[model samples]
Target: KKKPQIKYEEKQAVMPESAAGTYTFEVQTIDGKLDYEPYFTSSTLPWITGAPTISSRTDPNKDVISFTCLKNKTVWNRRAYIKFKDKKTGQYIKGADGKADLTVNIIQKKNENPVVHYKWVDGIGAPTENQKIKMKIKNNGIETEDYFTDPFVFKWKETADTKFYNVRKLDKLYVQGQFPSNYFVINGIRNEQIQGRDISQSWAKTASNMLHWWFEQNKDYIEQYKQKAAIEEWKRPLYKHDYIRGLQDEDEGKKSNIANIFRAYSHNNARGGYIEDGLTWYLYKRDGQKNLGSIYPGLFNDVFAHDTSPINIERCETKKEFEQLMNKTLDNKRAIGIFWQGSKGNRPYQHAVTCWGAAYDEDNNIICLYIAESNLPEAVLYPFGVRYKGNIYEEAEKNRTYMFNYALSKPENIYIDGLTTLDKGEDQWKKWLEAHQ
Candidate 1:
């Protein structure tokens, strides 16, 4: 007689607090002739109680085994397993082909406090007087509420307290306007801008576009600030060189140089900065271009490099090594900047992103990475998995659904750059601008 085989409707189960659940396994003989029954050989979780006997056998070819998982008072996550056997011959049923083990998972209950989520709208261009901040309140892992608030403020300062200006709540913050480079505090909690303080050059323009894209993808989790009053503020003009000069003219009582009063609030710097290529080239020039002018390296060399306080940059040569390094970096309260080859429109080239965190499957296997990129304002997740070919060094996409590949060293080959005071200088300049304002 052929040996009995078993298959489960679901290999894993996650039960919420105070919720009981059940799953069934179908058993059949290899020849579809011999009768078989089921039983549990062992269970990993002691609290998980279920009978091992066969529940039913509607057809002569197959039988059914059912198991139940009970809710618990403990807040910890739990797991369990069960084995099968044939009742006629008292022989343990083996798994079909390469499959054998079955498992169940009970997820931890959700925390009570609503998690606070935040996002930046519009490109991280120059801050403007009309900029609006919006926020979303989430509950039970769902975005239950959203609105704008003015219970916070923006402040800019230069070297050693050069100047400070209050950017009061506004009805509208322009998508592409100028504002001082500074920090903002909401509800007395401080938050830093991710894309540095200034959008001064051409590369910043592309970065701005990318930031907007990120925001769109993750708008649900973003927190925003709403203005207290609905008053219509003056619309700020786009890049204008004389606009800053006009502000100066008004301060000096010399018949404002610009005709429009709104000209007084221009980004002050030249508008319409560099194109993407120019931005990339300029970043390469400031940093090093030896490694194809990769974004992470360039950003590190330009912004994070220091003479007195040196920083180390490490690269991952293998998939396993990459995952381990990523985990370690996040554990140390650091972020990773990654570069990968991708396509936009019809052009295929290397793109850059930042890895903020990672997630694991039930098996504790690395499954996905939480990443943020300039193209989008909010953070999103990308799946990570390995496909072993003869030549493991070479990586390629296994399918269209796979956003990240294990073999593609271009993306797998990552670097971890230490954080630095590059932002300090930007903050100083913001203070300078605020002083002038």
Candidate 2:
């Protein structure tokens, strides 16, 4: 026998452990006859939540292994792996690297850190220019630890009927397109550094970074930038009568299926930015088509409010300009939307990503940028200039667009709001005023 061959894509896997229990994962064999009955092996340690529960849909060419891990209650990291043993002989099977058995290492990354959520509130006084650290848990028709006070919203009997309903008194109300700042950066980050199915480590590492200097640059816009953040907290109505229960059911889970309702107010692994009405301008560039033809609600939520909206930002013609613009965007608690056109394997290709943060050295020079890559379900801090090597500049092709708050389908159109582009920066340092106006 040819040593009973067996193989799969990755020999390692990880888990976020966000049970809201019984988290599951799958391992599928690729190519080359991979049929054979294999039993799983793991230690009896309590830390190992669970292991390969069963293998299904297995055939001669491909095999599927599914794992169900019970909730990892511990606050520390745990290690586990799944190995295959010959079901007929109860012996370890060897293949590929002349190894005695095929192994898949697992890490139940139970993170013990600050899990933060940014929310909005109606304040009694005027909105502060600085981030007031305004946060409160909006739960069970009540809010706690909220630094702001006196909430209110609209009261509408129908989509057309709009009457002011003070949130303090219990009331409700509810709520595109069309423009592009028409800008794309010239240089973009490379693709290799970011992109994965289960890049949990990348997320854990990025989340550990705290914002210190990033906030320093935000002082200018943080005050106004916060207006958008403050507005999101307002619960609006959908149908003419949704206001009846709008504020009470802020999450609106009632409209969803029962399975999701049982999942609770929030689920795990739920996954930014300042641009205002930029989406409309982006759409305008593409021929002024009406929105909803192409739009995403969450994406639209990213648009910055009119008062604190961002401007043209200096053109990113040079690395210096790029750094300045990036710092400004990140500081305002907004992700940097980037579009890159490059080549790999000698073929033309393009990729897009959202950057949420960055790492700067003692001199205030950027060491690297943090980008949320595609698919890897992960994002990381990677280099941009030679200072960090293997950076966005070295990896990406020249023509790039650095922006924020726009949808994917028509990343080309008028951003529903706060969407602009990277050019010689025609107005250079002008504000993105028209977007919000």
Candidate 3:
């Protein structure tokens, strides 16, 4: 057989270098022609239209130029210009706002000291009891740069009236929201949105496109929760609960006896206690809604924290095992589990989620179920019509799933509490099992 051929597109040429050169231009105002002596490069050139425009001398290359405007000269005009002889006009030409051959000079001078100013008239308010004052640093200029120390911050002090204040790094400033200015590359941050902000630049379109893609993936979830109006109901609000209350309640009921469901951890130094609350709430929502608003003192107690249930053996090593786990806990229903992994000093990239009741089939390999918390939490059913970002179940298998040979007690046999509410039903158990699995 003939070898198959592959085709590819041709690469395009790079952009041409900018036409940037400094030239001495004679200024003839509406009044009259100005003197050449005062028109030296450093000397402030009188405003052509509104404010004074100035230019710096070009280097030996004549390919780069620098321009500046007197205080408030081109402030409203917002344009910097490089005076160069136009090839067509044969007279001096000036580049428009950002179109200038010179790189942007956004630095402003106040009292002979370079100072960057930001004014937010609408959002400013007095700092409350424990609330500290926060400032937003934005790149309103043209260049792409990190928030470096020298340029972004000024100083800090432990006490209000201290002569010896610490000069802190400027980039240390906290960023509250997305870029407050429209100039910076808006999509540089994760999940940045530009709906209510200005969207006139190319960066804005980039941001808008990303936001559109985000919505395309999640718009369904947004609309679903919007209709449900569950608790803060605006943007998928997560609920919270008292962990100890659930454990006590589970212990109280014997026939329904979900026993030994409370494990105690030091409440004094619990990191991300709030996240624990949220996780407990979701568990209760998935398991028992009747105990939603119960209270507990000191710390939270949950199946994860306390239950000593054995992992269901029937579903321990095979697709059938996982399927049974899913069927028992999920009851053939679709549900989502949100989990965060990169906590308590772990690798920063640690994150994975799976849908409880979905499964994927590997080609000539074992069929695996989707076990991550994500949007397309279904299994890879190839040929019939299952498509994903990459090799689906195969990739998941490499990351999380393990294969085990069935024996009386395999190392793969997961542990769980025998006498817990988790054993409610094969269906109900499957629902919860699928989530944990």
Candidate 4:
């Protein structure tokens, strides 16, 4: 009789103690049929029931690992090849895709081994790194050290009403076009380098007084401009004759020419002077528009106040309330509007601008929209105008009934009576101002 053939049911091996390690193998049989059972032999340890568990967390006891067997697989005369790899990195180590393949040699069981019986079993899924970490827990025979990760959280909210576009546009325009031109130089000097000089000159003065001061004060650095014209030559643009040489009495009637003088004076040969100068004119025009549009609340708000009304007044904590209060003052309309309150940096409600409009969304949910001229960039609208962080929708929901306030006149006057009366005695406006001063 022919010697009985021996075969391996499967070609795979596992560690006796695994955090989450995985592997695969293939088997060969003495007979050319793979349907005959084959068993894997491991150098580390013999086959044991329920090897190890896999999980997504470092806690080894928390989650379960799963496995699956591929059905109806064909083997070539009982000779088969298999592969594996990690599911995440897609690295195959002679095993299935998304799994790891450890090397193993298949051997036939002895003929007298009571007809060693076995069935091909699919692999238990990859052990998670998290579980692997926990599996390294030292068996102190007492309590295990707990390991965890910060919970990943997500917050969502609805979009609120805003006047961000116009406010942001205007504020950006204000900062970009107005502030610098009006204040870049000091007391008409372009390069005074003076620590403290008065800069109260009207935007209409240029060159002579200012340029003279700059060059004279900066004489110590004359070598820096060796290639440039002498200081006297540089003053040509500032001389009274050069500046007012072509002026005609009636030329003042031309708005463009009149605007040119202000531009030349404010932007007089300084860094970013042109834009700054143009901004001053832009602001003046906008200010004039503010006066004209006073009748329209939306337009008025756009011109003077930065849009900074609380969308969710009722829902804010005391800290939030304090910020809201500080930003919402009714004095000096332009000056009193929300600015950077320090805490809510780069965000709207943190700073105050002005509120020009409010509206409801498709869900009939009220939204507060405002505009602010941030120090960052002119065209960037943020905080109140956009959804960045936090629960703005819930804030809006909890703080319904948004109130819009208007000043009958300028913000200074409103605060004098409204704020002063409340802060001081009802009749002590002048006295309070005096005391504060």
The candidate that achieves the highest lDDT relative to the unseen native structure: 1
lDDT of 3 at 363: 20
1-437, model 2: which lDDT tens digit per residue? 34435565444474546342444445455444444553335445454344565455555555555555544433334556567766666766564576557666666664333232211111112222231222233444355554322111111111122211111100111111221221111111121221111111112111111111112223333334343333333221100111222322222222222111111211123222112122322212223222312221221223332323232323343345556666665444432444433343366534333343343432354433333342221111122211211123223332233322111111221111121222211121134322333
- Please give the lDDT score at residue 311 for candidate 2: 28
lDDT of 4 by residue, 1-437 (tens): 43222222333432112211243332322322211211222222222222222323233222223221222111101112222233544543332232335333322121111111111001112112231221111233333464221111001111232111211111222334434433322222243331211122121222111222222333333223332324344333332211122222222112122223333233222111211122223222334323321121121122223322211111222323422433342121111222222222243222223222222232222222332222323222222311112232223322212222111111111010011000111122223234333
The models' CA-based lDDT, in order, is: 0.32, 0.31, 0.23, 0.23
How badly does each model clash, as a count of residue pairs? 34, 52, 37, 39
TM-score winner between 1 and 4, please give it: 1
Taking the tens digit of each residue's C-alpha lDDT, what string does model 1 give over 1-437?
A: 55544554443453444345565555553445345544444434444465644677667666666666564432224434455545676765554344544333334342222222222122222223333223344444455455312221121111222111111111122233453222211111022222222222222323322322332332332211011212123211211112121222112212111111112211223332222322233222333323222222122122223322121245444445555665565444332444443353365444444443344432333434433333332211222332222122233332111233221212232232211100112333233334333
- RMSD, each candidate, Å? 16.7, 21.7, 26.9, 28.8
How accurate locally is residue 3 in candidate 4, as Cα lDDT from 0 to 100?
28
**Candidate 3 lDDT, tens digit per residue, 1-437?**
43211111112211111222222222222222221112122223332223223343233212222232344311112222223343434533332333433112222222222233221111112122232222233343233333322221211112332111011111122134632333221221124432221111111111112222222333444344244433333213222111121121112111110110111111221121221232233233224322322322111122223443321222132333333444444442222221222222233322222222232221212222222111111111001111222222223332322321111111232221110011211333334345443
- Cα-based TM-score, every candidate: 0.30, 0.25, 0.19, 0.19
State in Å the error of residue 20, model 3. Answer: 72
TM-score of 4: 0.19
Off by over 4 Å in 2: 1-278, 281-315, 378-437
Candidate 1 Cα deviation (angstroms), residue 229: 47
